[PDB]
């Protein structure tokens, strides 16, 4: 049985535990290609089910995702409960190495769910986004305001009846919003932001803006300060909202890949990988070994690129302005290889449904060998010159520290999670794309996640990625770069150019789109900045019915107020430098 086969996961012990606790008629098991047990729960039992899952002997400790779905236009809902809308909750048990998706059905008139924030504190921003884009209210939310769109926005854009395209520009509304920006500070009240006890008459409220662009993007933080100390802060995000999920409903399965590239714009093929894996699950495609090795090599090259930018920008944020020049030279060596292979630098859009766009060009191994010879001396030089400097250490060690429990309750993944001692990397826990055939280690911290431990963990991750790249260079399999499946999009170009049935398949795949049979698929990968996941719902058409992108930077930015409370503003900017986020990842 292939890994993409539709399964109900009734053999999962969590299904038997839920049946013993709540009864057989309390929930409905849905068969998916998500790889996880999908369980439809009544709305009135959601908090009970969540508490039961949190109190299991090997408990579900992290709320991985929480979002909504407009099911009104979905025609293939066989075996599913009646629902105009739905809200899903993806929960992860690291100790079990398992996960469960809970789905709550909602009628159009009764669009309210109990809040999940008492069980999982990252449900705050997840429910705010679900309210913003779908109009689903969450009862008991401390402050349920829009998080992506401005507060004076009409409608909920992820609803199926909301038009996707840009509306006509108007200078009058730009003038009005400029006036709101001008008198935003004059009419600032802490109550609408969730802040309290401000203006005591000792705290000040200070807004941060687009004044420190360290390649992360534009966003705002309003800080409540007792003198120099942060007593509370909320981040203002949505300034980088691109409507990428709505675009997922707007593009074909093939023509959405460039948009996947720009979700986390320092990641490239890393961003492409979960989307094409989830589409290949929908299509029932198993890629050959050469495709797996090529995709792993591209992912690790882009992981090294992103880590180089992250480490150098952290060093620049601390104050040492020199290593960014050399690290971008190393990024140019990576770009030499990536340009030669894919034809592009930052957004290659090179992965395909069923494979990659072209075969490897002749001479790729020379460029890979040159980069693998160039990198280690440069990395050691950066370590000795900057990361072992005691001023940088005094600026970063012990700054914005959190443990394993705080990382689990906020959905922190990647190096921030592993610096707390939790050994959870997707490439080892849930292997994908042939990562199990590579010899590499997962660096973990001592139990405490500071700025410094996160940065050094990413340095060790860079070294491990260099090891994986060495293995990719030494053992690259001979074979096809595209699968021999009819839904491989596009087909191999030479057969398209001389064979009529292949030309027909190409013609219909690039124009109307490949038809993905109606299913739900999920793919989780270890991205550059944490765990990135694609959750795709196909309604049997050539476009996605729903494209949900879970990004780790959203969770990290939500964790910011809990970790930085009681610190200084300098600690905050160092913390932002050490998070490894981009605003495109946060806002999608």
């Amino acid at each position: 049985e292939p890994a993409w086969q539709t399964r109900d996961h009734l053999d999962d012990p969590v299904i038997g535990e839920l049946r013993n606790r709540f009864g057989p008629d309390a929930f409905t098991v849905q068969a998916t290609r998500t790889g996880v047990p999908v369980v439809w729960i009544k709305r009135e039992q959601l908090l009970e089910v969540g508490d039961f899952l949190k109190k299991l002997p090997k408990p579900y400790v992290m709320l991985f995702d929480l979002h909504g779905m407009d099911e009104r236009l979905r025609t293939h809902r066989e075996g599913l409960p009646a629902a105009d809308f739905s809200v899903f909750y993806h929960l992860i048990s690291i100790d079990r190495n398992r996960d469960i998706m809970l789905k709550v059905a909602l009628a159009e008139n009764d669009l309210h769910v109990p809040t999940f924030t008492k069980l999982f504190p990252n449900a705050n921003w997840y429910e705010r986004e679900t309210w913003d884009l779908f109009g689903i209210t969450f009862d008991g939310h401390p402050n349920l305001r829009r998080i992506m769109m401005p507060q004076t926005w009409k409608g909920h854009p992820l609803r199926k009846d909301y038009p996707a395209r840009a509306t006509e520009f108007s200078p009058f509304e730009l003038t009005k919003a400029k006036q709101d920006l001008e008198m935003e500070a004059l009419t600032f009240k802490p109550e609408e932001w969730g802040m309290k006890r401000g203006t005591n008459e000792d705290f000040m409220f200070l807004n941060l803006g687009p004044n420190h662009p360290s390649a992360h993007g534009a966003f705002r933080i309003v800080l409540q300060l007792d003198g120099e100390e942060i007593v509370d802060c909320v981040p203002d995000i949505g300034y980088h909202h691109r409507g990428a999920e709505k675009m997922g409903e707007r593009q074909s399965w093939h023509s959405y890949i460039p948009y996947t590239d720009r979700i986390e714009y320092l990641g490239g093929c890393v961003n492409e990988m979960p989307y094409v894996l989830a589409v290949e699950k929908l299509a029932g495609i198993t890629v050959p070994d050469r495709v797996n090795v090529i995709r792993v090599m591209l992912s690790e090259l882009f992981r090294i690129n992103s880590h180089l930018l992250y480490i150098s920008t952290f060093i620049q944020d601390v104050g040492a302005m020199t290593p960014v020049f050399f690290a971008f030279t190393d990024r140019q060596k990576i770009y030499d290889l990536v340009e030669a292979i894919t034809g592009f630098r930052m957004h290659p859009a090179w992965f395909r449904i069923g494979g990659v766009a072209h075969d490897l060009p002749r001479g790729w191994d020379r460029l890979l060998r040159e980069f693998l010879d160039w990198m280690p001396k440069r990395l050691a030089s950066y370590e000795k010159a900057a990361l072992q400097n005691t001023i940088l250490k005094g600026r970063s060690q012990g700054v914005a520290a959190y443990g394993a429990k705080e990382a689990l309750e906020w959905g922190t993944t990647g190096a921030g999670l592993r610096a707390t001692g939790i050994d959870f990397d997707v490439r080892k826990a849930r292997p994908y794309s042939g990562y199990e055939n590579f010899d590499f280690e997962i660096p973990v911290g001592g139990g405490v996640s500071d700025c410094y431990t996160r940065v050094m963990l990413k340095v060790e991750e860079l070294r491990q990625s260099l090891r994986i790249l060495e293995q990719c260079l030494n053992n690259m399999p001979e074979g096809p770069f595209k699968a021999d499946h009819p839904l491989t999009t596009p087909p191999p170009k030479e057969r398209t150019l001389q064979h009529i049935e292949t030309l027909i398949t190409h013609f219909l795949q690039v124009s109307w789109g490949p038809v993905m049979p109606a299913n739900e698929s999920f793919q989780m990968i270890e991205a550059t900045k944490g765990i990135n996941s694609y959750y795709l719902t196909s309604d049997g058409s050539t476009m996605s019915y729903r494209t949900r992108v879970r990004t780790p930077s959203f969770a990290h930015l939500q964790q910011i107020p809990a970790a930085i409370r009681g610190s200084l503003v300098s600690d905050l900017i160092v913390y932002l430098g050490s998070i490894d986020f981009v605003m495109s990842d946060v806002d999608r």
Partner: protein
């Protein structure tokens, strides 16, 4: 019946085959040679499924689902591995000889063969040998021929010969060298040849008119519309690209036209793309023609109309119900005139009275195929109401259908039905001034003048019922033919009487009403059909008004000093000299039209109205069904200087500017509400389509496919800034892809058929409740009137027989599908298909005048000595001259008129 497909239970009709039953259930089985309207023949072998004897059977056997009845307790599997392998092998065998042609093939993106190649999963070629090749034929100006792409599915010949009764298309050769086409190069002679471009699943037969300005299906902007070229009211999907009307596709209406159009509707759309159309309001100031915008045109027209002492309005059967009503409201009911002549108005109102007061049910176009005997009186149906002629051919094949049903043959086994029937057919009797295209299947044809055809109808009615008035002076041979018709009509379970206004005779319609009444009095399930002239002839008849002669009298006497002519060239309904003199006498002529007509030279103001592609409205077809047509595209999207509005919008704004000195562009639903409030006989046009607030789960209905391309480049040469999406306040459709076109959406107006995996016209299967039936949530369009409880009295005005007077030549109308309709004859592709102008003569009359075939003779009508070449008509009765109605220079009002000094030029 109960079937089990892949272990799932389904309830189906046992009289259906497994292919149409499984397609009606939403299951996907690839198929080529089967069509819902043509039956099953089992040729292509694509539709293989695995049938098991019972539930406890694992072996099974491969069967053709189209040839297998969907009987009770039938166990089949579609997703069986051997069935999937065989279906892929059938696609592969078709692919061995198929040309590498998809980029340069007009079927691409709309091709059933492409869809089934992808559906079977065949994408790898292992055949390595040569491909067979064919030369192409020239098939005329409408259909392009490319025999390389043929998969030998036999759909074309089955449709063209067995369905449409065409004679000049066939299959030649044998084995893998079978050829589909004409026996030699020439134009396809069938009036329904254009349906080949949708019947053929490949790109062999393609739309040449679309091929000139070709674009793919995903790039089209579609709207549900009604064909404007005659009164039948076939549902169409016009598709536009880059501001020009590109194609007319068939829009499935299970009540009216189902799968098929006629060639006039399919190819006569070219007048929309004419470059001489008015695009802006133009005011004639002396010898100058200045261009106005909408507001100042309204202000100037309103000022001049306010200064006038009496304003009259002249409507047209070309215009919609809303436009004619808006003109009637602008000028007043007592000042409103229908644009047709007095005799045409009398015939149209008599046909209307027979339809909605005769007590006899009038069938829809699909229902015509279920009648057991047909009498056509006077109306050359193939040239005037062509789709009715196609339906009549199906009703004629009903006898073979009944004979095969007596022998327990399934209704989809079409070859067995045709073999059992042989040449047997239901009785058909056609009367005309000459031969018709229905003479090949008619049991009898009566070639006679219109008075003699009416007398034959009156005699048939009298022999059916003695209370009907008798006819004196019937010859014994004609009496024997009358008796043959009488026993054929009396023995029929469902007789159908077809007539219309195109014969130019009131007595023909009266005789048809008498025959229908006599059949109704005997307890028969009789139906009556009236063929009108134009798309909204019945709507103009229901609205009523004075004739064009009265309007010209008002203009000539000086009682009216302002005339507003709506969508009427005025020369088809009255003599051109009288019209020109009356319009020159009037100090204000305003012409609201979308075509450059001859009366615009003397017009003081010309309002650039919208054609059907750029407008919304309602039209009433020949059976009284109100149907809404929706705007296809915004004419101002590319050319921002284009001020081309709906006629009702122009006239409503003119009325508002005349009354309150303020402009009011209004909304379509407001005008429809005004129509149904003021005219109760048109109250059913409210329910022809839902209003503009209708939504499918909150979203509008999309006009263009979801893969519509070039949004940020199609207007980039004009400006790199993308314009605002055109807003549609009038209807529930949006001028974008951001809308709903799901086959399961609860609606009746479908702009185009597309489903995932079905890009061809076969997606209409997904849009239907059952395949070949109706649309899933009802066919659009409602009937204005029900059958009345009581009928009319017998018409006692039996005319005298035709007598040839010396020196006077009675004009016999000859209609042409390509040429008689005004707008379609303006289409450039129709000029090659148009017959050359002529005059038909009896051999005795031509010998008396000393002329041969081809000699040019001259005649004077209303002081216009015009010269035409003579051709000899064998079937025309002496004392008559055959003239082609509706052509250039020959108005349709000349039918039934008389000619003087007809002599050799």
């Amino acid at each position: 019946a109960t079937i089990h497909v892949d272990g799932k239970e389904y309830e189906v009709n046992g009289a259906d085959n497994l292919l149409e039953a499984c397609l009606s259930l939403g299951l996907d089985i690839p198929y080529f040679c089967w069509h819902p309207a043509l039956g099953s023949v089992g040729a292509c072998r694509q539709c293989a499924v695995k049938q098991y004897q019972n539930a406890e059977d694992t072996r099974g056997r491969l069967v053709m689902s189209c040839m297998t009845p969907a009987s009770d307790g039938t166990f089949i599997s579609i997703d069986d591995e051997e069935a999937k392998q065989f279906r892929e092998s059938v696609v592969e065998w078709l692919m061995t000889n198929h040309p590498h042609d998809c980029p340069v093939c007009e079927e691409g993106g709309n091709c059933h063969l492409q869809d089934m190649t992808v559906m079977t999963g065949h994408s790898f070629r292992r055949y390595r040998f040569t491909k067979r090749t064919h030369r192409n034929q020239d098939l005329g100006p409408f259909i392009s021929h490319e025999m390389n792409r043929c998969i030998a599915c036999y759909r074309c010949v089955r449709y063209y010969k067995d369905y449409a009764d065409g004679t000049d298309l066939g299959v030649y050769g044998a084995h893998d060298n079978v050829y589909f086409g004409r026996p030699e190069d020439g134009t396809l002679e069938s009036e329904f040849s254009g349906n080949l471009v949708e019947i053929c699943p490949t790109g062999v037969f393609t739309d040449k008119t679309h091929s000139e300005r070709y674009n793919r299906k995903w790039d089209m902007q579609f709207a549900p519309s009604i064909c404007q070229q005659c009164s039948i009211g076939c549902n169409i999907s016009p598709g536009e690209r880059y501001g020009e009307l590109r194609r007319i596709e068939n829009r499935y209406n299970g009540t009216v036209n189902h799968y098929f159009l006629c060639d006039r509707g399919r190819f006569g759309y070219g007048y929309v793309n004419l470059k001489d159309r008015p695009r802006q309001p133009v005011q004639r100031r002396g010898d100058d023609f200045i261009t106005l915008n909408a507001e100042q045109a309204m202000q100037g027209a309103a000022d001049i109309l306010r200064q006038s002492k009496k304003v009259i309005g002249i409507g047209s059967p070309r215009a919609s119900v809303e436009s004619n009503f808006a003109l009637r409201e602008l000028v007043g009911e007592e000042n409103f005139y229908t644009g047709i002549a007095h005799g045409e108005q009398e015939r149209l109102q008599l046909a209307l009275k027979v339809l909605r007061e005769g007590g006899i049910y009038t069938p829809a176009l699909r229902e015509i195929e279920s009648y057991d005997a047909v009498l056509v009186l006077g109306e050359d149906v193939t040239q005037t109401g062509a789709r009715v002629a196609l339906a009549v051919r199906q009703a004629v094949k009903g006898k073979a259908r009944e004979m095969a049903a007596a022998q327990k043959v399934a209704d989809w086994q079409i070859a067995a039905i045709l073999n059992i029937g042989q040449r047997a057919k239901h009785p058909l009797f056609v009367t005309n001034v000459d031969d018709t295209r229905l003479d090949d299947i008619a049991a009898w044809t009566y070639r006679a003048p219109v008075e003699d055809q009416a007398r034959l109808g009156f005699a048939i009615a009298h022999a059916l019922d003695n209370s009907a008035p008798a006819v004196d002076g019937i010859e014994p041979e004609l009496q024997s033919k009358i008796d043959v018709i009488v026993q054929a009509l009396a023995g029929a379970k469902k007789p159908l009487i077809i007539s219309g206004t195109n014969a130019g005779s009131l007595e023909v319609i009266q005789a048809a009403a008498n025959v229908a009444k006599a059949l109704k009095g005997r307890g028969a399930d009789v139906g009556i059909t009236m063929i009108a002239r134009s798309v909204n002839s019945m709507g103009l008849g229901i609205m009523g008004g004075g004739s064009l002669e009265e309007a010209l009298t008002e203009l000539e006497t000086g009682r009216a000093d302002a005339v507003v002519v709506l969508e009427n060239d005025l020369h088809r309904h009255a003599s051109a000299i009288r019209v020109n003199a009356a319009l020159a006498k009037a100090p204000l002529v305003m012409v609201v039209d979308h075509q450059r007509t001859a009366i615009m030279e003397n017009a003081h103001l010309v309002l650039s109205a919208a054609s059907f592609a750029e407008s919304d409205g309602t039209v009433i077809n020949n059976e009284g069904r109100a149907q809404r047509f929706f705007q296809v595209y915004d004419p101002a999207y590319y050319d921002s200087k284009t001020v081309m509005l709906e006629s009702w919008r122009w006239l409503h704004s003119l009325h508002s500017t005349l009354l309150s000195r303020e402009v009011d562009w209004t909304q379509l639903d407001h005008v429809i509400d005004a129509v149904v409030a003021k005219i109760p006989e048109l109250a059913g046009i409210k329910d022809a389509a839902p209003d503009a607030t209708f939504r499918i789960r909150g979203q509008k209905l999309a006009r263009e496919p979801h893969r519509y391309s070039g949004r940020t480049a199609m207007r980039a040469n004009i400006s790199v800034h993308e314009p605002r999406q055109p807003q549609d306040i009038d209807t529930m459709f949006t001028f974008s892809m951001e809308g709903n076109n799901q086959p399961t959406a609860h609606r009746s107006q479908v702009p185009f058929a597309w489903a995932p995996g079905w890009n061809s016209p076969q997606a209409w299967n997904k849009f239907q409740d059952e395949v070949g039936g109706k649309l899933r949530f009802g066919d659009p369009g409602v009937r204005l009137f029900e059958t009345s409880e009581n009928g009319l009295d017998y018409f006692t005005s039996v005319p005298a027989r035709f007598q040839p007077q010396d020196g006077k030549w009675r004009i016999a109308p000859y209609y042409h599908l390509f040429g008689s309709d005004e707008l379609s004859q303006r289409a450039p592709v129709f000029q090659s298909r148009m017959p050359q102008p002529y005059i038909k003569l009896n051999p005795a009359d031509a010998a008396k005048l000393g002329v041969n075939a081809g000699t040019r003779v001259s005649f004077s009508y209303d002081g216009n000595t015009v010269t035409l070449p003579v051709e000899i008509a064998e079937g025309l009765t002496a004392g008559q001259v055959g003239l082609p109605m509706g052509m250039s220079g020959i108005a349709p009002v000349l039918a039934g008129a008389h000619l003087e000094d007809l002599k050799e030029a």
